RNA sequence: GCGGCCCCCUGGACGAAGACUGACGCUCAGGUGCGAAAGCGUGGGGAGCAAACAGGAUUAGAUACCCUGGUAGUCCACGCCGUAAACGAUGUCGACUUGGAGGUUGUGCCCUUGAGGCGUGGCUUCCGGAGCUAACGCGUUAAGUCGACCGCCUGGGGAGUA
C-alpha cells in the first residue's frame, strides 16, 4: 500500500513507501540461510568491472527453490517473508513429509494456501507443471529455458509471461520485454504471476535512500576531462560529440546483440 | 434480499403476534437485517452508486420510524435499540 | 496454361472504380482488369459502362486457361455491380451461382467522420 | 399473422429450431415484428431465443460463413 | 444474398432474382449508412423526425379525406 | 437449490468419451444432494457454422438442479477439458422432456 | 444515462386478494451525495477514428471547408474536476375539472365455445373542449381552479467581469 510520507523534513518530502502488513515480522528460517559477502564490482584481478557498486546494508542469501522438482507431495504456505536479494517477497512452504523450502510468491498467495508440483498438478495460481500441460494463452511465471535448468524468465516482482501458441515440441512465449521466444515444451513453468506488483510505485526521496542499497554516485561524462572520458573537455558545457560509452562504442541507438547460435529461438525481436 | 424464511422469522421474534407485520419494532428490525446485509455487498462493489440509493433510503426510513417510536413510547424505544444494537 | 475448368469471378465494385479478378476455385488469381486502367481515367470509370469494358477485358487473359464455367462474387456497392455480371455471359461463360460477399460489421469498427 | 406465439400460450425456448427458422430471413436476420405480427411481449422472447441458439451454432449468424 | 442458378433458366431471370435478394436484404442501404459516422444525437433527431412526418402525413390524408375539392 | 440447463458440445472424435463423462458429471451433481431431471443425449449434429473447423459436434443436455457452489466447479471442468467446446449454463426452473 | 449472449451480487416499480402498524406525513436554508463530454495525475493498452501537426488542392489570401497521413485523446484501474441548449428552456407533494385515437405492462367476468366482448389499474405518444395567455400555444402527464414549502427575477451594456 503506497503511503506518502509527510514532509516533516526536506528529504522526507517526497518519500513514498510500499508497506505490506502480511509479511512475517520476525527472523527468517535459519537452515535455509547462507553467507553473502559483497564485492563492489571487483573480479579476480581486483579491478572494478561494473561501476557504481559499493557499500550498502549487509544481507544474507535465502536459498530459494527454483527447480520445484518435488512432484506430488502437497504443500502449505506458512508465511510471507521479505527477501533482500530479490524484488519479490518469498514464501515459506511446508511439504507433507516435513520439509520446508522457499518459493517466489505469486500475486494471489497467502498463508494457508495449498500448492503442489508435478505433471498431475491442477491449474491454479502457484501450482507448477510442465508447459506441455498448461493451456495455451495462460499467464505463467518462473519459466525455464532448458528442461531442469531451474527457472529464468519472469522472476521479478509483478512479472509474467504469456503462452501464445504451442507448436509441436516447442512453445512460443510472449516474454515481458515484448519478445516472442520458442522454448522446449518440457520446461516447467509455475502458473500465476509474481507478487509485489507495487514495487514500481516506491520512490526513494533522498540520496542516501539509494546509497544504502549499494549504488554509488554516477558521474556524467561531460563533467570529466578529455583523458578520462570520450565526452570530456570543454570550457563551459560543450558536448559536440555523438554520445558514446566511456570505452568508445556508441550508445543511444546502436544495437549490440550478437549470438548467432540462439537466433533460432527468437521468433520476433523486441518491439 | 431477506428471503421469505429469513423475513418471516424476524416477524415472529419482534412481533407481538405471529402474524403482526408492520409494528414499528418489526419494521425497524426488518430494515436492520438488510442494512446489516448490504455491508458486505458494498465493501466489494464500491462503485455501485445506483444500489446505494436504495441503501440510503432503507437507512433514512428506519431513522424516521425510530423518532416516531421514541416519542410515542420511550420505554419501548430504549429497549429496541439495545436488543438490536444501534444509535451510534 | 493448366487449362482450368471451373473458375470464380471476383468483382470489387466501389464508388470510384471496378476491379475484376478471375480466380480458380482454390483462390489463385489468373488475370484481372480494372476500369481506370482501361482508358477511363477520371469521372468516367465510376460509370457502369467502364465496368462492362473491364469485364470483357478480364474475360480475356484467361483465353489460354480455357475457362468455361464461372461463379460471380460481387463485392461492395457502386455502379459496376450488375452491368459487369452480364458482360461475363457475353463472353460465353456459364454462371454457376451468384454470391454477394460484402463486408458488413456488426457495429464494430468506427467509420470516418462526415464530409461537409 | 399475429396468432403465432399468442395462441397456445407458451414461453419460447431455443431448442425448437423448426419454429425459429420461420422467423429469420434467408440471411439469418431476424424478421421485424411489423412484417410477422408477433406481439411485443413475445418478440423480445423470440429475439433473445434466436441470439441464444446462434451461440450454440444451431442457427447461422449469416448466410456466408 | 446467395442464389444458386437452378436448371434451365434464361440469364436475365436469374440475375433479376439475385437483385431482388439484395433489395430484400437491404445490403445497399446498409453500406450507405455505414460510410460516415452519424453522431448519436443526430440519429435520435433523425429518427424522431422520421416518425413525426410519418404520423403527420397519416393524419393529413384522413383530415383531407373528408373534404370535397370541387 | 437453483435449477440449471447445462448444455455442452464435445469433440466429434470423442463421441465414445461422452458416456464416460456424462455419468461423472451426474455423479458430481448428485454427490452434493443435487437432483437431475432431463438427461437427453442429442447425438451427433452438423454445425450451422464451423467452430475451430469441426463441422460436427456431439450435444448433451443435463437439466440439473444443483447448489450454486457445485456448478462453478463444474464449469471449470468444462473449460480445462480439451474435448468440451461451447458449454452453456442457463438458469431456469421447472420442466422436462423437450426437443426430441 | 443505460442495447450481443451467460453466470454471481443488488436497488426500484407495478398488479389481484388479504393481514398488520395507526398520522409514523409534505417541503426544506445551510450540509451531504450522485452528476454527459472535454480536461488533469499515476500505471497499463492502442485495432478504428481523430484536436495539434505535415504535405496536396481550392482561393485574390485559405495558418478552414475537400484529399492523403497523423500525436494527445477516445479504452481499463484508482483518484481529481463539478460544468452543458445538464431542455418538456416548465421545482416537489396533494385535491378538483368535458372527450377521442393509439403504444406498453398487469388483472376480473362471460358463448376462449374460433384471430372474442365487457371492465379496472401503472407508465406513455398524438389531436382537441371549457378555461388560461401578449400571442404562439398548454389543455386530467395543464401553462385550468386551489393548498404547503423552497429557489430565483426587478431596463441594456460594462459582467456572470474585477
Ligand atoms: Mg542517474
Ligand atoms: Mg572539469
Ligand atoms: Mg579521447
Ligand atoms: Mg559556451
Ligand atoms: Mg555549438
Ligand atoms: Mg473518404
Ligand atoms: Mg443547498
Ligand atoms: Mg472523460
Ligand atoms: Mg488519462
Ligand atoms: Mg497513459
Ligand atoms: Mg482528416
Ligand atoms: Mg449553469
Ligand atoms: Mg440531456
Ligand atoms: Mg434551466
Ligand atoms: Mg425531497
Ligand atoms: Mg393539445
Ligand atoms: Mg468568474
Ligand atoms: Mg462559463
* Residue B11 belongs to domain with CATH number: 1.10.287.10
DSSP F53-95: S-SEEEEEE--EEE-HHHHHHHHHHHHS-TTEEEEE-----S-
**In contact, A184 and A220? CB cutoff 8 Å:** no
**In contact, A146 and A155? CB cutoff 8 Å:** no
Question: Method used for this model?
Answer: cryo-EM
Distance B87 CA to G148 C1' (A): 32
Question: A147 is written with which cell numbers?
Answer: 528442461
Q: What's the residue count for chain E?
A: 70
> Do E and C make contact, counting contact as 3+ CB pairs within 8 angstroms?
yes
**In contact, F60 and F41? CB cutoff 8 Å:** yes
The resolution in angstroms reads 3.3
DSSP B40-74: HHHTT-TT-HHHHHHHHHHHHHHHHHHHHHHHH-H
Domain that residue B17 falls in: 1-88
Q: How many CB atoms lie within 10 A of CB A56?
A: 16
Q: Measure the CA–CA gap between A101 and A75, rounded to whole angstroms.
A: 10
Question: A102 is written with which cell numbers?
Answer: 522457499
Q: How many domains does chain B have?
A: 1
Q: Measure the CA–CA gap between F100 and F60, rounded to whole angstroms.
A: 12
Return the number of CB contacts < 8 Å for C and E.
55
CA A24 to centroid of ligand 14, rounded, Å: 60
Contacts of E28 in chain D (CB under 8 A): none
Q: Measure the CA–CA gap between A242 and F83, rounded to whole angstroms.
A: 60
Q: Measure the CA–CA gap between B43 and A106, rounded to whole angstroms.
A: 25
Q: How far is CA E22 from CA C51, C81, E10, E17, E19, in A?
A: 19, 11, 19, 9, 5
Q: Does F99 touch chain D (CB under 8 A)?
A: yes
Return contacts of A151-154, CB within 8 angstroms, 24+ apart.
Answer: A151/A66, A151/A67, A151/A68, A151/A188, A151/A190, A154/A194
Q: How many CB atoms lie within 10 A of CB A120?
A: 10
In D, minimum Cα distance to E3 occurs at: D26
* Beta strand pairing call for A139-141 and A114-117: unpaired
| Grid-cell match 517466489, residue found | A104
- Kind and range of the H or E run holding F19: helix F18-30
Question: Nearest 5 degrees, angle CA A90-CA A96-CA A99?
Answer: 55
- Kind and range of the H or E run holding E27: helix E27-34
Interface of E with D (CB under 8 A): 1-2, 21, 24-25
Question: A67 is written with which cell numbers?
Answer: 527447480
**In contact, A78 and A111? CB cutoff 8 Å:** yes
> To probe the interface with D, which of E22, E23, E25, E28 has the most D CB atoms within 10 Å?
E25
End-to-end Cα distance, chain A: 32
* Beta strand pairing call for C69-75 and C6-13: parallel
Neighbours of chain D (3+ CB pairs under 8 A): E, F
Distance E52 CA to G144 C1' (A): 28
| Grid-cell match 570550457, residue found | A235
> Measuring from the CA of residue B15 to each C1', which nucleotide is nearest?
G20
Strand partners, C31: C22
Q: How many CB atoms lie within 10 A of CB F35?
A: 12
- Three-state SS at A188: strand
Question: F48 is written with which cell numbers?
Answer: 450451422
φ, ψ for residue A168 (rounded to 5)? 60, -125
**In contact, F58 and F15? CB cutoff 8 Å:** yes
Contact positions of strand G to protein Cβ (< 7 A): 4-12, 19-25, 34-35, 42-43, 47-50, 65-67, 78-79, 103-106, 115, 126
**Nearest Cα to Cα of residue F88 among A124, D15, D65, D29:** D15
In D, minimum Cα distance to F87 occurs at: D56
- Among D25, D29, D64, select the one facing E2 at the smallest CB separation: D64
> To probe the interface with F, which of D21, D52, D57, D61 has the most F CB atoms within 10 Å?
D57
DSSP conformation class of D32 = P
> Measuring from the CA of residue B22 to each C1', which nucleotide is nearest?
G21
**Nearest Cα to Cα of residue D49 among D23, D2, D12:** D12
Contacts of C114 in chain E (CB under 8 A): 36-38
Question: C84 is written with which cell numbers?
Answer: 459487369
Return the number of CB contacts < 8 Å for D and E.
12
Question: A167 is written with which cell numbers?
Answer: 507448436
Distance E39 CA to G156 C1' (A): 38
Neighbours of chain C (3+ CB pairs under 8 A): E
Neighbours of chain E (3+ CB pairs under 8 A): C, D
Separation in Å, CA of D63 to nearest CA in chain E: 7
**Nearest Cα to Cα of residue E12 among C85, F70, A51, A149:** C85
Q: Which residues are CB-contacts of A35 (< 8 A; sequence separation ≥ 6)?
A: A60, A61
**What residue segments make up the domains of chain A, in order of their start?**
1-113, 117-194, 195-271
Q: Which residues are CB-contacts of F46 (< 8 A; sequence separation ≥ 6)?
A: F55, F56
Given the candidates 2.40.50.140, 1.10.10.10, 2.50.20.10, 3.40.50.410, the CATH classification of the domain at A1-113 is: 2.40.50.140
Q: How far is CA A239 from CA A222, A224, F61, in A?
A: 7, 11, 77
Q: Measure the CA–CA gap between F31 and F66, rounded to whole angstroms.
A: 10
Q: Measure the CA–CA gap between C39 and A108, rounded to whole angstroms.
A: 68
- Kind and range of the H or E run holding B30: helix B24-35
The CATH code that applies to domain A195-271 is 4.10.950.10
3-state secondary structure C2-33: CCCCEEEEEEEECCCCEEEEEEECCCCEEEEE
Q: Measure the CA–CA gap between B27 and A187, rounded to whole angstroms.
A: 63
**Nearest Cα to Cα of residue A124 among A173, A82, A75:** A75
What are the helix (H) ranges across C1-116?
Answer: 48-59, 83-89
Separation in Å, CA of D37 to nearest CA in chain F: 25
> Measuring from the CA of residue F5 to each C1', which nucleotide is nearest?
G6
Q: Measure the CA–CA gap between D30 and D23, rounded to whole angstroms.
A: 6
> Do B and A make contact, counting contact as 3+ CB pairs within 8 angstroms?
no
Q: How far is CA C97 from CA A150, A184, C18, C20, E19, in A?
A: 61, 49, 20, 17, 13
Contacts of F49 in chain D (CB under 8 A): 57, 60-61, 65
Amino acid at each position: 500500500a503506497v503511503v506518502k510520507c509527510k514532509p516533516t523534513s526536506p528529504g522526507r518530502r517526497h518519500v513514498v513507501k510500499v508497506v505490506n502488513p502480511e509479511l512475517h515480522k520476525g527472523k527468517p528460517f535459519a537452515p535455509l540461510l547462507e553467507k553473502n559477502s559483497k564485492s563492489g564490482g571487483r573480479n579476480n584481478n581486483g579491478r572494478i568491472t561494473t561501476r557504481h557498486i559499493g557499500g550498502g546494508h549487509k544481507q544474507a542469501y535465502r536459498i530459494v527453490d527454483f527447480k520445484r522438482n518435488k512432484d506430488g507431495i502437497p504443500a502449505v504456505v506458512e508465511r510471507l517473508e521479505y527477501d533482500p536479494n530479490r524484488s519479490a517477497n518469498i514464501a515459506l512452504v511446508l511439504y507433507k513429509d516435513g520439509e520446508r523450502r522457499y518459493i517466489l510468491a505469486p500475486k494471489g498467495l497467502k498463508a494457508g494456501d495449498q500448492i503442489q508440483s508435478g505433471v498431475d498438478a491442477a491449474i491454479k495460481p502457484g501450482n507448477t507443471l510442465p508447459m506441455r500441460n498448461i493451456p495455451v494463452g495462460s499467464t505463467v511465471h518462473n519459466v525455464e529455458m532448458k528442461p531442469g535448468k531451474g527457472g529464468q524468465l519472469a522472476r521479478s516482482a509483478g512479472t509474467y509471461v504469456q503462452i501464445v501458441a504451442r507448436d509441436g515440441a516447442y512453445v512460443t512465449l510472449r516474454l515481458r520485454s515484448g519478445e516472442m521466444r520458442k522454448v522446449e515444451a518440457d520446461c516447467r513453468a509455475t502458473l500465476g504471476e509474481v507478487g509485489n506488483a507495487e514495487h514500481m510505485l516506491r520512490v526513494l526521496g533522498k540520496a542516501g535512500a539509494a546509497r544504502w542499497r549499494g549504488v554509488r554516485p554516477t558521474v556524467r561524462g561531460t563533467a570529466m576531462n578529455p583523458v578520462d572520458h570520450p565526452h570530456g573537455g570543454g570550457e563551459g558545457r560543450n558536448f559536440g560529440k555523438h554520445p558514446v560509452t566511456p570505452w568508445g562504442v556508441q550508445t543511444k541507438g546502436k544495437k549490440t546483440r550478437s549470438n548467432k547460435r540462439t537466433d533460432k529461438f527468437i521468433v520476433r525481436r523486441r518491439s | 434480499s431477506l428471503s421469505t424464511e429469513a423475513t418471516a422469522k424476524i416477524v415472529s421474534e419482534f412481533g407481538r403476534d405471529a402474524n403482526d407485520t408492520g409494528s414499528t419494532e418489526v419494521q425497524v428490525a426488518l430494515l436492520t437485517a438488510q442494512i446489516n446485509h448490504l455491508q458486505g455487498h458494498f465493501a466489494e462493489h464500491k462503485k455501485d452508486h445506483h444500489s446505494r440509493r436504495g441503501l440510503l433510503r432503507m437507512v433514512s426510513q428506519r431513522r424516521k420510524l425510530l423518532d416516531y417510536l421514541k416519542r410515542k413510547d420511550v420505554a419501548r424505544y430504549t429497549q429496541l435499540i439495545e436488543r438490536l444494537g444501534l444509535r451510534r | 496454361r493448366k487449362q482450368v475448368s471451373d473458375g470464380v469471378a471476383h468483382i470489387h465494385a466501389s464508388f470510384n472504380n471496378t476491379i475484376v479478378t478471375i480466380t480458380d476455385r482454390q483462390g489463385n488469381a489468373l488475370g484481372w482488369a480494372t476500369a481506370g486502367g482501361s482508358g477511363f481515367r477520371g469521372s468516367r470509370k465510376s460509370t457502369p459502362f467502364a465496368a462492362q469494358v473491364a469485364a470483357e477485358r478480364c474475360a480475356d487473359a484467361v483465353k489460354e486457361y480455357g475457362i468455361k464455367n464461372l461463379e460471380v462474387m460481387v463485392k461492395g456497392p457502386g455502379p459496376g455491380r450488375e452491368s459487369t455480371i452480364r458482360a461475363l455471359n457475353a463472353a460465353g461463360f456459364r454462371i454457376t451461382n451468384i454470391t454477394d460477399v460484402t463486408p458488413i460489421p456488426h457495429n464494430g469498427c468506427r467509420p470516418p467522420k462526415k464530409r461537409r | 399473422f399475429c396468432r403465432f406465439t399468442a395462441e397456445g400460450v407458451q414461453e419460447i425456448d431455443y431448442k425448437d429450431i423448426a419454429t425459429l427458422k420461420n422467423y429469420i430471413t434467408e440471411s439469418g436476420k431476424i424478421v421485424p415484428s411489423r412484417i410477422t405480427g408477433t406481439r411485443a411481449k413475445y418478440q423480445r422472447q423470440l429475439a433473445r431465443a434466436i441470439k441464444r441458439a446462434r451461440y450454440l451454432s444451431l442457427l447461422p449468424y449469416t448466410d456466408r460463413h | 444474398p446467395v442464389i444458386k442458378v437452378r436448371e434451365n433458366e434464361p440469364f436475365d431471370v436469374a440475375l433479376r432474382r439475385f437483385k431482388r435478394s439484395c433489395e430484400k436484404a437491404g445490403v445497399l442501404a446498409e453500406v450507405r449508412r455505414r460510410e460516415f459516422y452519424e453522431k448519436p444525437t443526430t440519429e435520435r433527431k433523425r429518427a424522431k423526425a422520421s416518425a413525426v412526418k410519418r404520423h403527420a402525413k397519416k393524419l393529413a390524408r384522413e383530415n383531407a379525406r373528408r373534404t370535397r375539392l370541387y | 437449490m437453483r435449477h440449471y440447463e447445462i448444455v455442452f458440445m464435445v469433440h466429434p472424435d470423442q463421441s465414445e468419451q461422452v458416456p464416460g463423462m456424462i455419468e461423472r458429471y451426474t455423479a458430481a451433481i448428485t454427490g452434493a444432494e443435487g437432483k437431475i431431471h432431463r438427461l437427453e443425449d442429442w447425438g451427433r449434429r452438423q454445425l450451422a457454422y464451423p467452430i475451430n473447423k469441426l463441422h460436427k459436434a456431439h450435444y448433451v443436455l443435463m437439466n440439473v438442479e444443483a447448489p450454486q457452489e457445485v456448478i462453478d466447479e463444474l464449469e471449470t471442468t468444462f473449460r480445462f477439458n480439451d474435448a468440451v467446446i461451447r458449454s452453456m449454463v442457463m438458469r431456469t426452473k421447472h420442466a422436462v422432456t423437450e426437443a426430441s
